């Protein structure tokens, strides 16, 4: 049929489940198919933001490139602004995580100083900030203490 | 070698000068026209080169009659010329038959006068293209006319600069059915698709064609629509 | 006469490109485009095969280009590139590099060692000039 | 491209009437400049007068014309063409007053001149008459009004404008001033205009070097300013 | 005219030393009428200069006869405003204005080091405002530098004082004719910035310091003495090697001076880097170079 | 095997100087700014 919106949604769900089961190439292919179908037809903003979030997650997981994953996360976050706080906060967390693992801890501060983040400032922001600092001083222990303090921070992703 | 005089034929195809006038039309201000279920909407970008210019001075959507709007793309002076001509024709028809000009007749008369300038001689053809609203007999109408003298009949279109993107977005979004307000939202969206710089109550002109007569929207209403997302 | 020489050149090129089995996987890249004058002879599978588009840097790409170019910069730490990234208007990569260069020159002009935000704003305004003449007709 | 489409008023690939384009360069050919401004309850025109030879009746050399008792005009570009356009404008104003029974609003007159120019550019066998025109007037319930034409047939209303060789710099300076918040009282308007012209030209002109013409709501009559009054304004501007 | 202006001034000096308030607006009209004339330009420039000298007399009477520096601002406004009518293409009468400003500064130094901080501050501010467009001829903005040096001395180089001096003399861009004294005053800029207690902004200024070249070996050695100062200005900012570089630079002077101690101090400075200088190839070469100096071994510390 | 032969050179001794010699002396300044000198 022609309900291309639902087709895109189911394509994204397929990609998410494939990644959860860890079949990366199949998740990537399903994501690309979803992107093509979305580009074919009209898409609301939440759908586009979710698709971009999934794309960024996949791009990070493959680990091949990070800047692209970072940008995809940023777009998903900006879109989720004002509409999906639950998704926006997670997107900000991924922003911080990708930036930290980009061996560029310093700029993390600027990100949490961004006006948009301030409204979303919360426990997770400081958790990521202290983790980034620990990485900055290059102490295995600093890292461990931070991990111990924020179990919830570690729960989401391996 | 040819493509200088509007008289001679190409050694194969068709006159060129008319095509060049069409090209001049293409490189003009964006314009958008949506035929809603119960009305028509016309929108156009109106940006001045600086803040000195007065935005309430010259308009780009004008009422030809109580129920026939009109927007243009391309050169301006030609737009003034043929808007004057169209008003004259509508009045002549009303005098003769004592009834408002049905839109299709106005469109074809305007097309005839427009093609009149493409005949031989030094008289260069119009470098503008026109979109006409209209709500006679109980159903909205939306026509397009061009220097060639042909007149189409769109359901929803966009002309001027970056018209390809507007057309793509239109066929993506507008399905068949909307009211005047949703049509307006779609139209302003389409303009934004290619519009440059932040849109304001003064950057763009919007007009509607209902069952109360064609009417241009005041800055307050267009600001209100510009607000509320979209 | 003297007009068919270019056609002779193009035909020689087509013959060499397709020609014979002298393959040695000698790849060819063409970066002159807006392909309407391109002969279908030198446009076909077996001929130049992969057609790849290079659109205007869009949103989520202007940010990547800005970050990449500004990587090595004094970075006053007060200019938010997000303002330009999310801002409207179409700007190509050459223009973005020019904007950064001119912001740096504006900063150095006032003996300012680290480029500051107003310098970036001035550079952005300067680089955006559109037609810059128009004639108030052609709309 | 250029080389064939450069002799007659016919279209070119990437539609471009080159002749009308050249008309504007002709306008600049005069070697003069002018600036108009619109105040709260007044409108002012300023131009620079250049008498090169003493053997010349300075009075007879002028660029401010009185189109009608209330509507004033300033011309720029080729002199003879400007005079012809001025005469046409006077004719049209008279005809309007005769036919419809009230003084022609400034905008309508500007529109008429623009239409004449357009019809000239469309059909061949008439030069585009390369002179640019600025009109100032007072419109009841609308306040002061400034309008500008061009040989191409395009026209528009302005809050402040320039014409001539230094058009771009003058308009940039005027925009800089206007984005600032001013009341623009009569004295303020004249000071602004003269300052803009001086700064663009960097001349600090003497009172015989420029002409000024102002129309005010209190006295809608378009009055050409006299040397004593302009000198007083200039010294006051110097403070 | 020349005779008219001369007689007017030389006769009305006595007539105006009695009147104080209404006196000024009697030469104001004749000053205006003289300025409006342009027959001679050069000679009328001299007449206007004489008129401005009489204005300076009005000013020193104002400082003395009546409240100190209470009407000088009015004089400056008058000679900035009435000027406009005859500064055609910003020329001529501006030259006369600065010719008068020469005497203005000649007396403003006396005002500054004679009168208290308030009137001199006001007078310096007014003359500076008068010379904002005035380029650095020999002292135009150097007057500003001297005034700010006075201020920093008075309040003892506040952080805002250091900022003011450094910005004022950074305004001294490549527009000062006197390169030599320009060097001599970028010296004071370096001194102030180093006194800022940063070593970082000190490095920033050290940029333009290095932009200066050949501060040494200059004729008559005065710049060389200035060289000493800048060579002396080099400090911890200069690494433990650079210190030996500039110490060797300064070591040229004491041998000329044959000083009993400070020359010994210079030799000790150029020899003591070694302990501060980490070992390397170039350090070895330069220690070999310095080694073997008879004047050096005179100190037992060399043997140690 | 004359500094000023055109009379008034303020325009010449100004932007031209500031864009000709400034990039000729201290490449460290610009490379630290990260901008290639004009």
Strand residue percentage of chain C: under 5%
Strand order of the largest sheet of chain B: 6-1-2-7-8
Name of the CATH class of chain B: Alpha Beta
Report the span from N to C terminus of chain B.
50 Å
Number of continuous helical runs of chain C:
5
Query: Helical amount among residues of chain C, as a percent range?
Result: 40-55%
Beta content of chain B comes to 15-25%
SSE-based structural type of chain B: alpha+beta
Strand segment count of chain C: 0
Oligomeric description of these chains: part of a larger assembly
Protein name (chain C): 26S proteasome regulatory subunit 6B
Subcellular location (chain C): Cytoplasm; Nucleus
Organism (chain C): Homo sapiens
Modified residues (N6-acetyllysine) (chain C): 118, 122
Question: Which helices and strands appear, and what pairs or packs with what?
Answer:
The structure is cut from a larger assembly and holds chains A (158 residues), B (230 residues), C (139 residues), D (239 residues), E (304 residues) and F (38 residues).
Chain A: H1 4-20, H2 24-40, H3 45-62, H4 67-80, H5 85-101, H6 108-113, H7 115-119, H8 123-137, H9 140-149, H10 151-155
Helix pairs in contact in A: 1-2, 1-3, 2-3, 3-4, 4-5, 5-8, 8-9
Chain C: H1 5-18, H2 62-70, H3 81-86, H4 93-109, H5 117-127
Chain F: H1 12-20, H2 22-25, H3 27-33
PDB class: hydrolase
Keywords: midnolin, 26S proteasome, complex, hydrolase, MD state
Entry title: The cryo-EM structure of 26S proteasome-Midnolin complex in the MD state
């Amino acid at each position: 049929m022609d309900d291309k919106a639902l087709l895109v949604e189911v394509q994204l769900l397929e990609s998410k489940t494939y990644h959860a089961l860890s079949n990366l190439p199949k998740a990537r292919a399903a994501l690309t198919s979803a992107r093509t179908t979305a580009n074919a037809i009209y898409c609301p903003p939440k759908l586009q933001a979710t698709l971009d979030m999934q794309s960024g997650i996949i791009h990070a997981a493959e680990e091949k490139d990070w800047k692209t994953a970072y940008s995809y996360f940023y777009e998903a976050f900006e879109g989720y602004d004002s509409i999906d706080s639950p998704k926006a906060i997670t997107s900000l967390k991924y922003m911080l995580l990708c930036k930290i693992m980009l061996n560029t801890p310093e700029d993390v501060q600027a990100l949490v100083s961004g006006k948009l983040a301030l409204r979303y400032a919360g426990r997770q922001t400081e958790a990521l900030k202290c983790v980034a600092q620990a990485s900055k001083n290059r102490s295995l222990a600093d890292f461990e203490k931070a991990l111990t303090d924020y179990r919830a921070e570690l729960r989401d992703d391996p | 070698g040819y493509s200088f005089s509007l008289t001679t034929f190409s050694p194969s195809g068709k006159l060129v000068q008319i095509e060049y006038a069409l090209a001049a039309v293409a490189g003009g201000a964006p314009s958008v026209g949506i035929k809603a279920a119960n009305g028509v909407v016309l929108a156009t970008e109106k940006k001045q080169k600086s803040i000195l210019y007065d935005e309430r001075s010259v308009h780009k959507v004008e009422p030809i009659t109580k129920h026939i709007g009109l927007v243009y793309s391309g050169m301006g002076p030609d737009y003034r010329v043929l808007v004057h001509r169209a008003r004259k024709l509508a009045q002549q028809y009303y005098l003769v038959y004592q009834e408002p000009i049905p839109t299709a007749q106005l469109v074809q008369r305007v097309a005839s006068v427009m093609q009149e300038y493409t005949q031989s001689g030094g008289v260069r053809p119009f470098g503008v293209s026109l979109l006409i609203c209209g709500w006679n007999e109980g159903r909205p109408y939306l026509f397009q006319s061009d220097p060639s003298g042909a007149y189409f009949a769109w359901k929803a279109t966009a002309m001027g600069k970056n018209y390809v993107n507007g057309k793509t977005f239109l066929e993506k979004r507008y399905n068949e059915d909307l009211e005047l307000e949703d049509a307006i939202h779609t139209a302003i969206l389409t303009l934004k698709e290619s519009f440059e710089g932040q849109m304001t109550e003064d950057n763009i002109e919007v007009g509607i064609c209902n069952e109360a007569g064609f009417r241009r929207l005041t800055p307050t209403e267009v600001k209100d629509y510009l607000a509320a997302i979209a | 006469g003297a007009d068919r020489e270019v056609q002779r050149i193009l035909l020689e090129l087509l013959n060499q490109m397709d020609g014979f089995d002298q393959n040695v996987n000698v790849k060819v890249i063409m970066a002159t485009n807006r392909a309407d004058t391109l002969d279908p002879a030198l446009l076909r599978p077996g001929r130049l095969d992969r057609k790849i588009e290079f659109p205007l840097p869009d949103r989520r790409q202007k940010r990547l280009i800005f970050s990449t170019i500004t990587s090595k910069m004094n970075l006053s730490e007060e200019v938010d590139l997000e303002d330009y990234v999310a801002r409207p208007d179409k700007i190509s990569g050459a223009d973005i590099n020019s904007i950064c260069q001119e912001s740096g020159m504006l900063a150095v002009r006032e003996n300012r060692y680290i480029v500051l935000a107003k310098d970036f704003e001035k550079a952005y305004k300067t680089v955006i000039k559109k037609d810059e003449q128009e004639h108030e007709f052609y709309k | 491209s250029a080389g064939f489409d450069r002799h007659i008023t016919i279209f070119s690939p990437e539609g471009r009437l080159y002749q009308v384009e050249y008309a504007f360069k002709a306008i600049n050919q005069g070697g003069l400049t002018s600036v108009a401004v619109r105040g709260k309850d007044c409108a002012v025109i300023v131009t620079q007068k250049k008498v090169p030879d003493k053997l010349l009746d300075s009075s007879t050399v002028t660029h401010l014309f009185k189109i009608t008792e209330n509507i004033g005009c300033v011309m720029t570009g080729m002199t003879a063409d400007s005079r012809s356009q001025v005469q046409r404008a006077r004719y049209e104003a008279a005809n309007w007053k005769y036919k419809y029974g009230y003084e022609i609003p400034v905008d309508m007159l500007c529109k008429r001149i623009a239409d004449i120019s357009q019809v000239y550019t469309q059909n061949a066998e008439m030069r585009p008459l390369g002179c640019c025109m600025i009109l100032i007037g007072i419109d009841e319930e609308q306040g002061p009004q400034v309008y500008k034409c061009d040989p191409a047939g395009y026209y528009c209303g302005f809050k402040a404008t320039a014409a001539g060789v230094k058009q771009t710099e003058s308009t940039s300076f005027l925009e800089k001033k206007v984005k600032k918040k001013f009341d623009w009282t009569f004295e303020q308007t004249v000071e602004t205009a003269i300052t803009c012209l001086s700064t663009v030209l960097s001349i600090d002109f003497k009172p015989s070097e420029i002409e000024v013409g102002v129309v005010t709501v209190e006295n809608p009559k378009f009055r050409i300013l006299t040397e004593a009054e302009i000198d007083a304004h200039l010294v006051a501007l110097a403070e | 005219m020349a005779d008219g202006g001369s007689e007017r001034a030389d006769g009305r000096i006595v007539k105006m030393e009695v009147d104080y308030s209404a006196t000024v607006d009697q030469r104001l009209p004749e000053c205006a009428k003289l300025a409006k004339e342009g027959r001679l330009q050069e000679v009328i420039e001299t007449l206007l200069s004489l008129e401005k000298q009489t204005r300076t007399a009005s000013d020193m009477v104002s400082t003395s006869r009546i409240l100190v520096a209470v009407v000088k601002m009015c004089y400056e406004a008058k000679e900035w405003d009435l000027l406009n009518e005859n500064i055609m293409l910003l020329s001529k009468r501006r030259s006369q204005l600065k010719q008068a400003v020469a005497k203005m500064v000649q007396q403003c130094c006396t005002y500054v080091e004679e009168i208290t901080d308030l009137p001199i501050k006001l007078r310096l501010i007014d003359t500076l405002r008068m010379v904002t467009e005035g380029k650095i001829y020999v002292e135009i903005e150097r007057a500003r530098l001297t005034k700010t040096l006075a201020t920093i001395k008075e309040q003892n180089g506040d952080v805002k004082e250091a900022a003011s001096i450094l910005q004022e003399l950074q305004v001294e861009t490549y527009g000062s004719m006197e390169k030599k004294e320009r060097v001599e005053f970028i010296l004071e800029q370096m001194r102030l910035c180093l006194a800022v207690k940063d070593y970082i902004r000190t490095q920033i200024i050290s940029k333009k310091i290095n932009t200066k070249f050949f501060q040494e070996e200059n004729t008559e050695k005065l710049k060389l003495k200035y060289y000493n100062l800048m060579i002396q200005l080099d400090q911890h900012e200069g690494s433990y090697l650079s210190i030996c570089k500039h110490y060797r630079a300064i070591y040229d002077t004491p041998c000329i001076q044959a000083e009993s101690e400070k020359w010994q101090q210079a030799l000790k400075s150029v020899v003591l880097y070694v302990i501060l200088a980490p070992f390397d190839n170039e350090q070895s070469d330069l220690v070999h170079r310095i080694s073997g100096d008879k004047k050096l071994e005179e100190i037992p510390k060399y043997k140690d | 095997r004359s500094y000023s032969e055109i009379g008034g050179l303020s325009e010449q001794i100004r932007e031209l100087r500031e864009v000709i010699e400034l990039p000729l002396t201290n490449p460290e300044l610009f490379q630290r700014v990260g901008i290639i000198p004009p």
